[PDB]
Design a protein around this ligand. Sequence first.
Ligand code: 9CJ
Ligand code: MN
Ligand code: ZN
Length: 351
Amino acid sequence: ESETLNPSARIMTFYPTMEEFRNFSRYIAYIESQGAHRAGLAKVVPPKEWKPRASYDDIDDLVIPAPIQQLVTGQSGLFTQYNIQKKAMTVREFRKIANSDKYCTPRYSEFEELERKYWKNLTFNPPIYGADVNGTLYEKHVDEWNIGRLRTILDLVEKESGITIEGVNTPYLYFGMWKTSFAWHTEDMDLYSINYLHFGEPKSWYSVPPEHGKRLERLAKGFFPGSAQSCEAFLRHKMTLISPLMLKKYGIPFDKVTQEAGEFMITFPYGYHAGFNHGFNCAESTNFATRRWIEYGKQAVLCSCRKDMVKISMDVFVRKFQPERYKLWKAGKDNTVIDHTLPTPEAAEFL
Ligand SMILES: COc1cccc(CC(=O)Nc2ccc(O)c(-c3cc(C(=O)O)ccn3)c2)c1
Ligand SMILES: [Mn+2]
Ligand SMILES: [Zn+2]
């Protein structure tokens, strides 16, 4: 029934109308009814009728409080990325640097060409990434797909505890330049992710199907035995880069997609993704949830070596949506196995 939907677990692209696009949670259930989640990542092109801001020509004095210089070390498809924190910076300053001859995009024809230059020049001339900036670039009046208030059940965290977790139930802005990267990771508590590329050069993405996630971890634990012994989930450190050739060489299935300005990317629970920016650009993102996430949340393996890391209490979710399992769960007897192929319950109206 569900194992027949998207059996190649390939990344799918959707073009909703305006009526379809009005309701966020339902559209997510819809693309899951089509098996999009099996790829771990999906692209949703919004209608030409739509825009979250009239103009971005007024944002150059916005502060990037904590820019990050990305220093990559390693060879032949395997890399560790170190962060060097630089002093605060404005968007206009960031733009100048990004566009300067030292840091700007090299010339290319096909995307494959830029892909090769990225994996060969990754460890040279470390770029600066304006990541994890608190804020949104949506006008306050836009009610469709507003990253600051998506109204999913993730709201239960704030609603019943008051806790805000920056970037997780609040938006982050990312200012990229050529060769800035995000390492292999799943989301905090294995939540969903949504990413909107407001403007600029493209952002390319790699993804591994959730049903093969463990194979990627097995491979990673084998290449970084030291890290694996020191932490139960070292990939959440967001430092590990692994080229597609390396994945191919060891038979991890993956897919890749390029996100262009004005497009959304959705990641799904336990979907490993990575990628890099093509040039100066600006993206907004946050996490969200569906009822299907709850079981992922109950089973997520967290970082065990840093106290700073993100942990959401699952208790309120299991009481409200799985009350008959609560005593079993709280007593450590909930042996439920996850089927990565089943769509979230909210998809019932489409099947
Ligand atoms: C010691 O290493 C770190 C510690 C704390 C925070 C970070 C920053 C980070 O990668 N944050 C983050 C956390 C979760 C994510 O989903 C993304 C992310 C980033 C992008 C992107 O760069 O556009 C795309 C997809 N995901 C980024 C690194
Ligand atoms: Mn992510
Ligand atoms: Zn750790």
